[PDB]
Design a protein around this ligand. Sequence first.
Ligand code: MG
Ligand code: ZN
Ligand code: ZN
Lengths: 1327, 149, 49, 50, 75
Amino acid sequence: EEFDAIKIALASPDMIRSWSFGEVKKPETINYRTFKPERDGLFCARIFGPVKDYECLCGKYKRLKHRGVICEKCGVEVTQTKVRRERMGHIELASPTAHIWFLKSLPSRIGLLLDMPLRDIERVLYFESYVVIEGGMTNLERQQILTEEQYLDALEEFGDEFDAKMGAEAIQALLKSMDLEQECEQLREELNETNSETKRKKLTKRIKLLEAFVQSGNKPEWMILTVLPVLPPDLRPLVPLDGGRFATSDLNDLYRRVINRNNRLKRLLDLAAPDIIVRNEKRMLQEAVDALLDNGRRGRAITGSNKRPLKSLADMIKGKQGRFRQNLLGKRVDYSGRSVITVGPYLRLHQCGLPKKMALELFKPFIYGKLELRGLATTIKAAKKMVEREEAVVWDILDEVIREHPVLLNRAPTLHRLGIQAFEPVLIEGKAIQLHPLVCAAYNADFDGDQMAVHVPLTLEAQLEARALMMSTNNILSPANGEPIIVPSQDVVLGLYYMTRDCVNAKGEGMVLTGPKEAERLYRSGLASLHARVKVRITEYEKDANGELVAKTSLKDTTVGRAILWMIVPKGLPYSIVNQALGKKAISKMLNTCYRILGLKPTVIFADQIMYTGFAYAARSGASVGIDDMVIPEKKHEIISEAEAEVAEIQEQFQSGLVTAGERYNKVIDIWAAANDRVSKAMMDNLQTETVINRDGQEEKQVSFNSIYMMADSGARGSAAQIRQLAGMRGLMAKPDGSIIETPITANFREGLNVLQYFISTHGARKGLADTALKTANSGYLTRRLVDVAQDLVVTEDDCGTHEGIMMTPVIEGGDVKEPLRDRVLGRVTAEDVLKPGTADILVPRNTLLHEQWCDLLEENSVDAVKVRSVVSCDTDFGVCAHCYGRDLARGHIINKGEAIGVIAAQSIGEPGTQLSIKLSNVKSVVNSSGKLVITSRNTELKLIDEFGRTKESYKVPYGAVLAKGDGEQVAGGETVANWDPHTMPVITEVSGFVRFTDMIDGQTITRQTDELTGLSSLVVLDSAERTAGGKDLRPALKIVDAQGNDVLIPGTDMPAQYFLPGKAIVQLEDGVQISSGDTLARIPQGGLPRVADLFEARRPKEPAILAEISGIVSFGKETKGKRRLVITPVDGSDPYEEMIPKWRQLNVFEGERVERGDVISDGPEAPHDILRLRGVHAVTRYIVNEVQDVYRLQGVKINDKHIEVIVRQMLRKATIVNAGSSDFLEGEQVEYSRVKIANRELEANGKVGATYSRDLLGITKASLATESFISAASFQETTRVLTEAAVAGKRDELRGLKENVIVGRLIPAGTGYAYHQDRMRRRAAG
Amino acid sequence: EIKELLKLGDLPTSGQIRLYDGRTGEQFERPVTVGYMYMLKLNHLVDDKMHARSTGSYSLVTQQPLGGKAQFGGQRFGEMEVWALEAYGAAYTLQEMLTVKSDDVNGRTKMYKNIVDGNHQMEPGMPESFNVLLKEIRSLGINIELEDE
Amino acid sequence: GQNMRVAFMPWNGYNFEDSILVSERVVQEDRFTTIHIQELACVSRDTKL
Amino acid sequence: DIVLNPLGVPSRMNIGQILETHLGMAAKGIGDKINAMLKQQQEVAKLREF
Amino acid sequence: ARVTVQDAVEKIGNRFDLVLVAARRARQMQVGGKDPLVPEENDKTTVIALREIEEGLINNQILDVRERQEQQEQE
RNA sequence: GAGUGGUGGAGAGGUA
DNA sequence: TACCACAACGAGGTACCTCTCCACCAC
DNA sequence: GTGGTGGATACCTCGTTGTGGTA
Ligand SMILES: [Mg+2]
Ligand SMILES: [Zn+2]
Ligand SMILES: [Zn+2]
């Protein structure tokens, strides 16, 4: 009963018979009057066991005492009724038949096994054509398909020597006659002669098929079914309807069809029918059994009796409602309630209000146990009726049972990890689950009718797991970012803002108070309001370097409300925390500061107290909204009038015919957006600074106590866009086609729109509410795909001991610092030391966890970039170590070994899918005659260093773009030195002298023309596509020489001073001119969520940026074709590389410069396949992490980067082979990188040559299907494909992933169960 | 026009009046908006919504509990919640939620009897839906079995 | 529905995230007690006994 | 009778409930003046005038 | 540990070992009927075992040598 | 040896 | 023989609630 | 009642993956 591997293979007919318990021989299911099953029918109890518990059919034996006997009048075996759903039947098929999975699961494995096309095999099994099996004559070669006319022609020609058959018996005899080892030896000798790509691919596919067959020991004859098995009868059950009519499953109908046609084929075979009739019935039997194996697969799916397609066995296994993803991964469960949620503000952080009725139902056997333990209940029936009478002793027993026994308040859609939290319930009357107001941010709950489930834990292990792991007071910080998730939200925030804000001269300002106790006595007495600026004596507590608490005391000039909140704030925090007005961000920073200063206990009790006082003082304010509270700026209609007047003037100038339609429309756009900005600015000023009626200093201007502005300014609800839409101008709404409407909505939601503006607004409304449907569907599919990629990853080792890692810089791209070094590097474990002076020559040790103190010291020393241990760099097979992962965010300290990293990262990535001086580098240049610095290289980027030595900004400069500055100078802000030609690309030189116009003759490579403006002759070069016969074999070169004609030598190299220019170059310089060094020579002119899905699925984009593959000098290799081949010949070795470029696709590099290993050749987006293939793993991880965090940074979503590193580490599991060494790997086999690693480990252990390889980057779908855990791939997708291939190869599953251990039903190898799993695996290895 | 109507009614023209507090007697600091909004009551009643289940009916094919308030069934602890328990690490909670609280007849009978006797202990077993999957692949014609050790 | 007196202010958290706090007199006047008429059926089927 | 949530208004942008709340209070002010005139039983001419 | 078990986390070192050793102790109290050495104040066995580990009368190797000691004096 | 049927499946509508 | 349109299969969100409707034939 | 059983709709959108065609 203890298995440790699920072994799968094909089924021999002897194995199918040895499963079986008797042949079914009749299509009659049961009788219609006396509802017992028949003899040898589809439910026949002589085959599939008894019907009642310990009985026979005739009722002779009725007792356990006849444990197993055979009733002589019925033939049945008396057992328990469990064997009714565990016995199998077999069908003796008359003719052999084809398993449709091995015919239509592409590629069919028969079309690759017999090397015959699927159309020919389909025409054989459609009974339309014959194939000879063997022939002694020379006319008929082996496996030659013949039509019926050719068949009868062969009969009248020879008729005796050959044998041509038609149907599944023909391919069965062919599968018998095919010799596996002989044909694979023939393949191995026939492969090595020529190596063409497509035929070599088909040949190695066939060699892998044959080698898998001879490894597994299956027979190729076994693909043809001769004995079809029958499912147990209690899994295709028969319960009737309420009115006696019997409604079956689909499988009884399918089996009835195949059994009836098998009986008719039996009658026609022993009748010896004509061959046309018997082959027609064989056709119909074949079609019926192909329907049974997969209805909607071969042809017309046979529909049921109710005008719907029938469900086959494959349709009962695979699907969104198949067995796997419907009843194995997610099960309906006992001990579970559901109710409408409501708000309990009077709770604490760990409590929920369970109703009396649901709790009395859920804890019913616990109540039975306590009732029997207290001597009141003696039997189960008395306990049942005592609960169903609902006595006061039952209410007391329930009140004792509930006490500190948690319940899991799940909410679905449980998107991220914190959607299940366990609370200690308190009893309430009523009918609605009460939540804390802090956890309804984690749940994304709104109390407008959201329903939540209550799951109970039963065992002691589960109560301790729900107390110590899933409590609400343990998941304070989300695992997406170390910033707490119990933030006050909108009402506590309005209350704390109204507490800690201050007026000017409200009531009793300028008093001096002993402290918070006297201040709160004053406020509750009413002699001083909450906004009087006073002096208080605050005895704040500075916590020192160790855990000691000194007490300092001085006088602070604060508000009465801040002095009252300081009474709540515990001992250990400074006062500048509370000393300003507290918005939502300041309150969350209060909680985070309190966390990393004190711990987990005072932060919890401080969060509860801060919610209590926030609610109470929000109630004592009375922050109400009116129609006067949305003040409209009184200079709105004037600037609106001026804007419409000037846009009428521009429209009149267009209708006169001066300007054009596109420029007029863009003018309307910029006018109305500028007026919108003016109205919004005047609105926010006329809302922000309005409480000016003051006294006792003067008529002073301060920030306003307006209610709309207060609720938008504290961070409570809505922002400046929504306030602008209320009060100011609604703006330019958009048509659905991506356009902008000409006339904006000049009204707002206080004056009220007219008809036309509201009809305009409905465009954006319906576009948003269809956007949410498509957004949520695609985000859910991305989340499930990421989860089923990232199953196989857990913390396994304590340390992998490597020193590799990612050089981590603060990302600085664009125009602004995107992420600081703090939010980039905090949490990691340092790969090496910090070998730079900075300010103090700090050398932090390697393998060091980055605390906040260490982040502060490296920020003070201003280290430019740090190398850290990354998850993709780890050297542990089957999971990554702890030090390469770093800090677990939800606990603050390092990752405890066992915690399933991959599902954490999958939820935290796929969850916001519903939200969606100067420095020169790589420079070869020359100062020209004008001093304006040009650049002669392609990969030059301009850097902006700081006066500390770090970086301010970075920009990429194109080749030949001009630069006004030299190196090292400190240019001030406002100077844009970025100077570029927007349309053309320069082809500048670097030497000086005179030009000899060689290798260009007018007529076949250059066109004689003159510019129509200046009259100067220009010898422009024509492209090689329109040249004559004399221009198809030579490249024009501007032979730049000295004053006499000598081709000068460039110092450093030995190549001559020639410039192979391409076509479309506007050569304007003439002969006899002086050329400077660097002067111009000629001119040549030119979403979010699908972006994340396209980066993770690893697709090749629509315009692949072509890149270089090797170092060396580049030249052209093949001419006389529009596909220009490029010989990139190395400076030391030969070139085996060429390339095919499309005609319209241009080229950016020239054939005179030398590139490095993996240079950028063509521009645009580039595919992660080639990014990996030329650069390497650390570069492709940097690319994927930056490109995904661009999307999550634009929408404003905080995600720690090690999640995306985990997903890329799961994308990079495979590795294909460029050369074998001595291990058992042939060539190019997509095998797991861990097996290659341990194979090279043992080969270097015993001193061998080792096997080389090449990492390859698969997408999410191909990665999770290429996972060798076939249970994991079959639970994910393409179930017929993966079951067919695993059955062919004879695979076994090692049962090491969480998905297969959840299907099978043990503890998962993570979390708690990881200790048990390593104990069980060392016990199984130890004997 | 609304402020003209309010001036006819002898009311504060802005609509905001100065409410008191019935709890502690004293005054709210700022004027509160008060009027008469027309509240409905929708067809989502909490008596129809609330439902709980301890141990009840069971399906025929998969031997896991039913679904729906009419059949007194339990909440589906779906795939997303299985990932939530996985990424917590509550392996014992996930195992007891997929075997003894669900489709495993011997384990759930030992569980019910043990909870009534007071000792919360768990004897697991292979789930009935996994046995259904084994019978369905074996009837499809692919030999799948449980290899020991 | 019925029209009833409404104040727009936070009240000790009990109207937090789209929640409503209702006076006693709304219940005492029975302004919102609907009637639900439910049909239960009984059929005398016919077994063969 | 109902203490609603003021933060439901400014972000969700349904100002119709705010204007309807004011207009409802105006309607009940007029109805209350008519109820006062009837419970004091002033004059059918004063009722007609108001 | 009745509100936050972080003191027991600092005593053990790891949440999973905390759950395992507290489950061992709670099973010993519910099956074997051994006396909880902290005063119980009308609590359940799981929170009693967490409070035991939180105080410091029981760790993993402490419970292991205790069960081995009662084993050898039983045999 | 001591009561009892929807899940099954379709269609339509609704909630978060 | 290496690109290439073209065709075929295989995905497409979780949880919940209410109601009705269910093969023809036939000596 | 108890075995028998074959025909007159179209209205997704990618996105891989395999296949005959042709310069
Ligand atoms: Mg809601
Ligand atoms: Zn019998
Ligand atoms: Zn590592």
